[PDB]
């Protein structure tokens, strides 16, 4: 016969939900200037990560019902909300605008672009009685013609919602963040080389904190993200359901060199007591449109790796099409992202123009001597006013940045969307660029982790009497 | 640090001289981590309420609540001593008509407890009765 | 000789104060009525309430200095304030109004009521140079004549303070709430059939959570409340102090059938980016004034019941008088309450017109065959703008509700006010309807409960040496 | 569940049987209900600084404070064990000159605990000094 | 041989930092009047202070890096911000003003002072449609000549900084505050008769809480403050450095009698829905400048008391000079303080014009033949608009106070600044009134206290085996 | 006598009065609205709790589990400012004992809990 015996601290957990906090070690905290929203809050990261490897475990994972995704989704949203809340309100600047073409019709170097507009307008000063007729510069993407008049114009989202400009001191440069659980919980990491996103996992490890994510939001192509191993891996909730999105993770980084070749002046006008709207003073030199530099050979090779895996997914006998984006709002239709606090919108038509033949590929572009037409130049433009992706209202103006701007980053993943139709016997599966969701960018990064609560008390029948 | 590696190990083999030492080492490590967190934060005074400040406070409250729960149970039915603790209730074999050696050499803690959850109510209620019994015997 | 011996968990409480939380079952959450001023914040109520009978205790109670009254008072105050705080601000609409008759002079069915006013006015929208001459509808109670010309009008509350309309999605249907104490405390319930409100109590019962209150605030009347047993009961701090109020608890429910017989249209006009004022579009069909249906004999017999208890209170040889209220603000002067998100104001005269003689009563009207002039019809009217009762600021506007409105509820209690004067030898004690206090409605509910802290540790000498 | 119903019954009659049986029903059931409520609340989440979240947060903070305080009190004077604890302090008859039979089979807890509301502080401090003497001996 | 033995609760503490809370006593809560400062938030102070004297202790102190001085300053700033945050916003009243001399030219009693200005202006009323030309009385300091000419005026801060008037119901009368630490910490008090601010201390005591501070913000002077006993003590961060401020504590109180001999009317004009600007109605009777009354021989006794201690600091053979600050901000240049919610600015030039000599000093004023020219009378003036001392923004307005204002307070300490120059062989050390710092006022109050954490766990070898 | 009264006295006398300090650090205006000092007090009390339970945890994890006094099995290393007994008891204070046992105190703590695990292994 037996009497139960208890053991506190047995290896038992249970799939659960809880709250998490961040960690920004100390490199961001060292500067102590232009503090980013995340820097002045996160607890210093523990210098030595602990990753205990688990054996003889086949825990099931499913990233499409991962609680930590939604939680961190509303986290980032609320953080931006409070981070921008206290600074300037831009509601009084919504008036009629009297605009000219650019600085002058005198153009050398592209011609009539229309991207400056030299708009003039009557405004009220800090003193209630005093009023002044002032002028400012605006891009085509930041102004709508109104009253059927060549001179008349207004901001885009006046008749819709409100605007509050970004608050100038704070930087928009992301930093790594480590989610760490409170005691009594742990995070499980699926370490397998290949994982489709749902199912049992062989290589399982236990950690107390995630690796730095460095939160970046982009449309069409992931940036400064993580890399796959030995191949490109695709994840979908239901491949047969073409309505859902496709997640692509690449096995090599791709260097992207974007720049804004324009010398800028930050002219500051007051509209109130503390209200100091910041606009562009002028441009020194020619107006060269912002663009991104990309290698041709590398792009082909990586996109061909995608082609093979995508073929493998939906049966060998297929022909692949990469049509451009159907339409809609600017973010999803045309590649957009952030760089040095300036939001770039790049026309990636030439990026997706490919029709792999069931019988024409498997030969990469191995051009050794190139020294020439090898850079893919992207026509990129600027929008200063950006609204909430999901919320109809809640807009934000971007203050201009003085001087020259240039980033260079690491393309690590793509967002794809299959469109059905006449592809059954044609076998012409068409994939278009996607985006517009805040959760997917991070779904691409949190699939490997899942949280479990730790229940240490355990019972075992044993013949020992007290 | 000190997280148990006996999760894959077979409950019985792991329990005897393989997990008991690690369990207390794990508790000591979590205690050291908590001390490091409470001292650095007190020195920085960066605990001013903000979204992140609320998120970390709640997490700390949950942690202390949970630990106190465990210790509370552990004490209130007479095991104020150490992780391992016997008891008086005879184990009604009906709960799982299975033999000891086979279970110890083959079964693991996670899969064990998930098919005991039905009778866990009964065993805990019998335990509290055994506490009452010995306290009115003394 | 003795040595003290200690016990942990002796039955010892103590008079105390603490904080409480709510428990709204699951039913409102099972309906997703979108957070009706207190839904998702409440913990699920325990399935099985535990009301341990107390024996051989004569615990004293006094409801007039029960703190939880005040605590839940301020709870309700802040809870309502935080619900209407994030939605629409309604300052800019305060202008001059140009108003017609009703909608039209074509009246069949009551004549010149004046309750629609088809008021027109110039206003400023989101874009602040396109003045819009718009119209809407308002009741005679909602609008004051400023400039006694003919068609010059303003919203009553523009001299006082500010207005913010109720936020349309949230409903107003109250739901039961259970106050529950944290551990270490308990609530004592006086279970006696008749209790005057202060003194020792014979039947005591300890719970941990109160029964659902379903917070309802009404004046001159108590609605969907609790019932007394076997008798009407009557409570007052100092009966001789005629200045204090009188709370009356009834032993039967009384059915009341109120309705708003008008088909309504919710016309929505924007005054800002997110600012969308909601007004009445029009009325389909005749304009029948809102009214409440009440049985005669029930009312008469229950009024007889109260009178007998009242001539037990102030001596047998008395003559009873029920004059209408003296005057003052609309709430206490004439009856008012809420129904389906519309605040009704019913003219309370036919109710309190009674002079039950010292020698004419003691026969209830048990009229069998009635089938006729048996319904007490109440002239009821609408006010859309309601202010804070105590503070002078903080007023709200009630959005119109489309379609037909109709409630039917259970009258359960009364508030009365003794007026002194020439009643000494006349013996003509006069009582009028009261109200205007947020506390009293709930004083009528929380009289039976009182909170006590539990300190378990106790000492007692005993001759046992360690 | 398992609340105090022995207040009416004379201190002694409740002490001999009711206090022992109720002790566990008072220590375990109340804590288990609190644990279940916390677990459902944590899984539900929606814990924002609203009018209600702050209230229940303070509620559970008060609960843990009061429980921990009692454990510290019992632990400091040697009641690190359970309900029943003797002491070395002789009960001075000058504090209360009453026979045991009257104290146990005539008088209850509430009335008696109020009567010592002047001697109680003196009693506890003496208990601490006796505990120190035991520490010196061992 | 030995085995370590653990001991809980030993006298080890450690230099540390933590958070503190205030105590206002039960009586402040009992008054329950307008929640002046933070009367309710403060916990009721303990009836019995506990001050365990510590012997055999030489603990070092240094007040210049005591953190609680910084903590107290930030706490006071936050409390003031919370108090003024919901107060009426005053941004619209900033217009041109059309002003006469004061009221009338019928002066008797000082002549052309210019302190009323009977300024008229054009301002919008609560209703946007109606605009009414109103007036208001303003002190000469409040309005600067603007647009030159003679009859155009505007408030000192408009483009530079917004203004929000003080909420009227709250009062500024300070009350004692007791900082109390949470458990696990203690405060050490240096009880020595004379302490120069840094070094070891003999007489030490551990206290549960600090004594009431009754925070007072004053310039060039200290009012309602702690008094040194049996000596006058002079403290400075660097005596060698002239720039470092010098703090002088006194051993006797000095009675000061300030008043505002004018009978005032609070005329209230609405500028919005809840916006009710409060201005002065008129003055009943003659207009007399505010005047503080001070005894001669007593102030002189304290001037000589300073002299002796000062020439004991910087070497015997010196000649002492008292000069007023030649250039300063209006608060910094002359004396200013608060009284009954009215900020007085007095001309303390007759308190700082003394040239103490090396010979002939040490003889006090024992004038028995007084009853006459024995009162130093201070020309004092009024400013209603006061801005943050440090931040260039956030200015407040003082509402006028009806009737007569009078104070009588307790002068206890000084702030002085040494100025270097031709004083080497001249030996003419010159000292000037200081101020303008929020910290220094409370640096004197918190000099004796310092906070220490308490770590109970200690380990010590002993030969006992378990 | 007193919260820090023992300080001046030698460690041995401090041990007799060490229970008055053990009663301090108890860590216990019931409503806590988000106003000013109210939340300051809430944060302060929340800290104090961690302080106690940290010290409590160490005690239980060590071979002590019981307050005011607990003895061990690790021999005291000469290297750790060894003197005599009359020196370390009748001559010097807890406050300034920490001064020379400070880098050693951490070494001693690691020693005690390793031995405590080792004795559990032997049992
Ligand atoms: C605060 O207290 C101080 C201390 O009492 C007051 O200032 C003191 O003022 C006295 C003078 O009233 C002064 O004593 C003089 O000291 C000088 C150097 O030590 C001496 O030179 C002087 O002798 C005479 O000559 C001076 C001119 O050189 C004259 O100014 C002075 O009045 C003396 O005059 C002599 O001759 C006349 C006519 O015959 C006769 O009436 C006089 O009595 C005298 O015989 C004095 O000895 C102190 O040195 C001063 N002390 C300080 C510290 O300054 C000060 O006024 C008080 N302030 C207030 C507001 O009350
Ligand atoms: C509601 O209940 C009351 C209580 O019965 C009813 O009141 C009254 O009933 C009596 C008996 O019918 C009436 O008395 C009459 O007295 C006069 C003079 O004494 C005389 O004509 C007869 O003796 C007659 O019985 C009495 O008038 C009547 N009211 C009074 C003043 O008490 C009452 O009718 C009920 N109904 C309603 C709807 O009010
Ligand atoms: C300060 O300036 C204000 C103006 O802002 C003066 O107020 C105005 O004073 C005149 C003269 O008394 C008032 O007119 C008078 O009205 C009465 C009543 O109808 C009438 O009988 C007189 O014949 C004369 O017309 C005027 O109403 C008043 N306006 C306001 C808004 O108060 C004020 O007198 C000046 N005070 C001083 C001391 O200079
Ligand atoms: C008018 O409201 C407000 C407007 C602005 N700021 C506010 N801050 C608190 C408010 C109230 O809570 C309040 O004053 N109210 C009165 C009582 N009330 C009722 O339900 C009720 C109304 C009429 C008759 C009987 C009961 C709730 C609410 C409407 C408040
Ligand atoms: C309350 O008091 C009554 C009256 O003494 C108790 O009823 C009696 O209790 C005793 C012992 O408790 C029994 O022996 C009797 O048979 C009971 N009956 C009578 C005569 O009433 C009652 O039990 C007390 N309740 C408690 C538990 O406090
Ligand atoms: C502080 O230390 C001094 C010095 O040891 C103590 O004074 C001695 O106290 C003992 C007993 O109380 C006497 O026998 C000695 O004559 C005292 N003087 C000496 C040794 O010079 C003092 O008691 C200590 N006080 C505290 C509070 O610790
Ligand atoms: C336990 O006993 C039951 C009796 O019905 C039997 O069916 C079962 O097989 C037994 N378990 C084993 C594995 O022997």
Author numbering:
A (entry chain C), C (entry chain A), E (entry chain E): 33 to 140, 144 to 146, 150 to 309, 312 to 321, 321A, 322 to 395, 395A, 396 to 464, ...
B (entry chain D), D (entry chain B): 520 to 657
F (entry chain F): 520 to 547, 563 to 657
Please give me the paper's original passages concerning this structure.
Here, we present cryo-EM structures at near-atomic resolution of two cleaved full-length HIV-1 Env trimers purified from cell membranes in styrene-maleic acid lipid nanoparticles without antibodies or receptors.
In the AD8 and AE2.1 maps, densities of approximately equal intensities corresponding to BMS-806 are evident in all three protomers. For the AD8 Env, docking was performed on a protomer (Chain E) flanking a more open interface. In general, bNAbs were able to be docked onto both the AD8 and SOSIP trimers with no or minimal clashes, whereas poorly neutralizing antibodies (pNAbs) encountered severe clashes with the adjacent protomer.
